[PDB]
């Protein structure tokens, strides 16, 4: 056996993956032993928590080279904001400078957004008295999370990239001077993939956005008009 | 690009840079920037030699949104399933990733109710490095756990991140030195074990019902992506050449 | 009933609802429950405010069910939907800022989470501590915690019922602003002033649109939480935990 089961205290079960030969890749052995380990847990209602762990410097390695090869062989005022979104291939919004209002929102529709620490970012629609447009009300909560989006959108405040970074955004935030160079490097790493794989994957990741954006725009239009 | 407000630059053969440079309007949406941006993206759509686009502004301006004039006009009204083992387990599961988590092995741990990473270890959803699309429910569990935006980069680029890099990017997982990871998992597990089993299972069932309900449709969509991407000679050479 | 909530009109368009049941440290006494409802009804009947600031006193934001209150649910005399405090900030037409200058415990933490803006104090303690008493989270915690803090952190928060300082949450990466306690209310006031720069109708229209999925989805989750309370609340060992661990 390549999975060891260790009880800790009364009701804790540790599942320790130890396929040293394969560094916890999914050999036949690790696969079978993992399934049996979870089946054993399922048959035992003493346990209240499971610790799944690896050994040494390996948690789990994924498909072995031969297992991947087996699969390979078969054994196994209404448009511009969404330009990035409708683009077939990945778009990096390298916002080396300020992104204000619809300019910010336009960039938020890119697959990868990079900010600059010194620049100003704002969904400032409500500063003019208007409810937000250009799909702001959809793309802000979707990229920045529901809670930060309520603040951004209700208040239309201005944040430096450095503020957003301290608030916890998922975007890479860099000094202005480094923004482009980081984007070109990331673009180079992206271009190492087959173009069909990039498009196939982006189509699947952004389908709910492409599907739901039109109705959000309609609701945003109805908010104007009131 | 016509109005001369958007410059296209090819970087290498497969990367196009769309640079917005309406200096007069500081990259606000003037007529020219609008038409030039639409023309730039149409150019991209009709030139599928590119694999990535970089959209950028000039100097201190990315894009300034509606013009002041435009906005005033409006105001005025003139215009075997290894991957789901942790998810199907009735009790809370802690993935103590004291070591590297690579591809399906990373994804398998992300289905746990609590994930802990090591600072020193490397984590990657590396499917796309081999040319094929992510499987094992990655395109569901990675955005579910790490948020839509970070998951885009992780999945599309198949990058390697130390636990310390993810901790800097803002993950909700606890990240510790390798040598503390298991001790902390055991302390957490002992705290969970203070609860009645029935309350733990009833609550897990409720918290993860929408994952158990949705995962099978996502797996189906990932299979559909694998049919389109897995069975190309290019995938076989990347597996032979780039593995470990 | 009748002086455990103070209402202060802080400027022409800003109202502060301050909870100050000192006897119960802002646990949900009958008096606190009644005054909070009354204060939100007053805001609903006077449609001139643009922002509400909900805050506590000294070191307490809100402490959740009183011990007696919890034991009545345990006995099956009541259920947590009997008085609906949990959703006051969500049902409010205008933006609500939860200025949590002090501790936020159980139903008191969750009630604050329904506000449109949440500010935490670094040195205060926050916890969805339901499970520590052996029963499942109610007050809509299983909806609002994952909504505001993200699926992954909510798992831990809800399952383990652990206590976090504001500093701990800040470190774990929450989208809420976390401040020294002494700065929390002034910062709430400043943000309320920036909110009060917008037209009231615009703020109401936008909040209605932003919180519509929450107002639509909450009632089904509350029903599921009532079902979990049916399976978990009325055990003897819950009474033992309430009696043994409260405080």
Residue numbers in the entry:
A (entry chain C): 4 to 79, 83 to 232
B (entry chain A): 1 to 79, 84 to 248
C (entry chain B): 2 to 248
Original paper wording:
Two crystal structures of PksI were elucidated; the first to 1.93 Å resolution using a crystal cryoprotected in glycerol (PksI_GOL), and the second to 2.1 Å using a crystal cryoprotected using ethylene glycol (PksI_EG). Both structures describe an asymmetric unit comprised of three protein chains arranged in the form of a trimer. The final model of PksI_EG comprises residues 1–248 of chain A, residues 2–248 of chain B, and residues 4–232 of chain C, 417 water molecules, 4 molecules of ethylene glycol and 2 molecules of glycerol. In the PksI_EG structure all the active sites adopt the “closed” ground state conformation. In the absence of bound ligand, the PksI active site adopts an “closed” conformation, where the side chains of residues Phe81 and Phe136 occupy the central solvent exposed cavity of the enzyme active site. In this state the catalytic residue His230 is found to point away from the centre of the site in an apparent catalytically incompetent conformation.
